[PDB]
Amino acid sequence: PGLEDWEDEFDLENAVLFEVAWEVANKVGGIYTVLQTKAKVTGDEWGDNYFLVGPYTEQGVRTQVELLEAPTPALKRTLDSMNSKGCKVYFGRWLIEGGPLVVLLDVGASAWALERWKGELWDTCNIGVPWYDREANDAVLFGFLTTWFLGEFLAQSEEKPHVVAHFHEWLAGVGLCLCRARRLPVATIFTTHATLLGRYLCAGAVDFYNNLENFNVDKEAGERQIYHRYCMERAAAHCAHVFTTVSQITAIEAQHLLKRKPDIVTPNGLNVKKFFQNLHAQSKARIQEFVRGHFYGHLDFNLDKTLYFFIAGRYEFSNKGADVFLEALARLNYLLRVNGSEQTVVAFFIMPARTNNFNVETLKGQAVRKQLWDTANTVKEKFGRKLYESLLVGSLPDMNKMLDKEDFTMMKRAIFATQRQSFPPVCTHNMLDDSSDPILTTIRRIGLFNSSADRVKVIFHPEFLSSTSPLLPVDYEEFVRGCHLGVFPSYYEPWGYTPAECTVMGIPSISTNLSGFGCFMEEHIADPSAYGIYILDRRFRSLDDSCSQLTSFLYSFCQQSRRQRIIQRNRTERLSDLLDWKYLGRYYMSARHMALSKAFPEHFTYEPAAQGYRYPRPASV
């Protein structure tokens, strides 16, 4: 089912959508990609009545925004006015798939108003940003500039349209609060993509989710010198016609930290066109060549029985669950050894870290694999030419005479290059702090040294995968498509971008019910594991018990036949439509309709989601 026909009974009444985010036209997070990929559907629903309001940055305009003249006289008039009133407001087209119009506000250009604005802010919300907080002061400037733009756009518009302003973090929350305080006619959505407290409370506290009700949010933000940022976020959530979260776990966090249950959850959709079995085969061949190089001299395990697990994303050890994955990898190593399995699990940790360079053993192993591959290819081409020559003369090859002295010299050189005594390095790079690295510390603590006995090899690649890289000449998407199972046992993950992209790429993944993507899949798929989606229970299980469940998931994945693994990959391939904005734009549409009805009930009435996007038991299981 399409997006244009969703809530088609709703008439926007020539309303104008101002989507306000600090990340509009400047990549400072993952919300930039959310806005970029959602712009297509949003502009389809709103045409040119859709404006992304961002902060002006020289890089963003240089690279992403073509500066334009306002299409309508109202926009041009407001832009000229506030440009003459001491602000520096740019208008342009964001050079992305949607081609949306962007109002960019130079917050620095209008810093002169800061003291009169933040004081004004204190006169309306009792929120006073400390001077030393650059981001909070910039948020106040951006919010006051956005509210100025909205007021001067409604004032300088004869038709006086219905304005839906959709703010996306506490950085835009100030403008939201000012829209409500000035009382100008704006239907307001507030989407929080991550509760501000949530990050600190997960990182610091031993347990954060089960203690959500037992948190003094005011006090907790107070000890961390971010009380003003917390108050800005909570006022935006409070001063919003519609409050939205990207996830149901973020919805719980916002309920217990922003003291407002989201009126709707708007999961982060994706442009699935951007992203399976033959492509997976090529990527798996490339991973297999890398593993051949990395384990040169130690290729004593069957590679056709080798499984490629990966955990990727930002190098947040506990938030991304790399600790849980490593514990489960040690337990699965024990399981595969005691069960005497011929299965091998190479688990990749693609988590960027400060690295000096590629480890010498890693680069040497890649060189050794290249040499053996070239030697085998040269000897194979010589053998093929000689064999074709022999068969052309009706002669059966005499294999003893097929290879000459030069072939044996090349092959003996290759074999000499093969010998190694040291085990393959756990990490592919030179860590600036090997002792303090959580992944390497955990690996050396649990006993995963890529030994021959270890059925689980661990390859920590503390750097993003790039095609230009010498070690792995593969970008992240192709490597992932070559893997068997993404493992993202995240503890704190308001939305799982890495597991979501893994799923869109058709790779079975392990997420958690503590992650937004994991909750979204758990509530959209009847039997997620059937579809390649393992939802680890991290809310209601201890870290040790969650490690046990992850080991169970990894072991059951290892114990699948190749036929079962293929069936499961086909199902996860089917799952990609859930994560497309063509479905997840429904929730943004309904949030905007809800806000319009709340702010303008006389003009709009809202009639309350996953219809056509439910995945029951696969018919074939």
Binding site: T124, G128, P130, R180, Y227, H228, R234, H238, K259
Partner: protein
């Protein structure tokens, strides 16, 4: 109070356990809602 409260906000953490708690903020915001 009031202006002194604003100056305390600007210098550092305010009385997040007292007057500058989110109760007063929520009231001064609900007046707008």
């Amino acid at each position: 109070s009031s202006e002194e409260r604003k100056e305390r906000w600007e210098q550092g953490q305010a009385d997040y356990m007292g007057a500058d708690s989110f109760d007063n903020i929520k009231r001064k915001l609900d007046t707008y809602l």
